[PDB]
Amino acid sequence: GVCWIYYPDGGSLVGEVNEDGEMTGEKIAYVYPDERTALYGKFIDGEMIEGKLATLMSTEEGRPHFELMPGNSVYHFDKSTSSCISTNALLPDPYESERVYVAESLISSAGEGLFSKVAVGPNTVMSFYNGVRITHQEVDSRDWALNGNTLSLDEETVIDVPEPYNHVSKYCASLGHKANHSFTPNCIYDMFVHPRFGPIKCIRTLRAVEADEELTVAYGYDHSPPEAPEWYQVELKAFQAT
């Protein structure tokens, strides 16, 4: 009796459940939304204690058969706090690392951007937006200069990637904070439940994208409270003009 439990984002936990209903054991896996890349190993009640990078090679009677990737990649549940972004800031997510890279943006004066490594279809999760977890009070009370990377998660929590973690040399465990804004975007932000990061948001394609295409999302600031940085306000006027 194997079970699969899917999150709305298409990731899943899979394994034999224990005497209670629980995803607890040495041979449990989280499988990413490509239904191929997996973190396989020790889980307790669905929390990843030690997941090793693996590839789902086939299923037989519903049971997944994995091959472990070479190396000693081990991941664990490591949800951020208000002050700690990650226990392993420089350890990349292995799914994201196959799909995106950071380079100078094609948008003029927009710094770095996030690009597709590979051609993908619509509705494809490309990247994860992890960061520290702070309150709306803190973010809303403070200057725009500090709020370049703040992303609302829900009514209680904002995710931020504060300096110096906005540089890839200090933090590359996730890369969603590298996608620039467009009013004509190819991606959206979407909820995601990640086995290392916990409840976060991801960048998901709206349409097919080609290899080396810049990924962009609409940042969705309030246009009539605009409560937004200057560069966006400019860009809004121009958009409304077209």
Binding site: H136, V139, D140, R142, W144, N147, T150, L151, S152, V158, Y189, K201, Y219, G220, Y221, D222, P225, E227
Partner: peptide, 6 residues
């Protein structure tokens, strides 16, 4: 307010 995607 001062965050994306609210």
């Amino acid at each position: 307010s001062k965050s994306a995607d609210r």
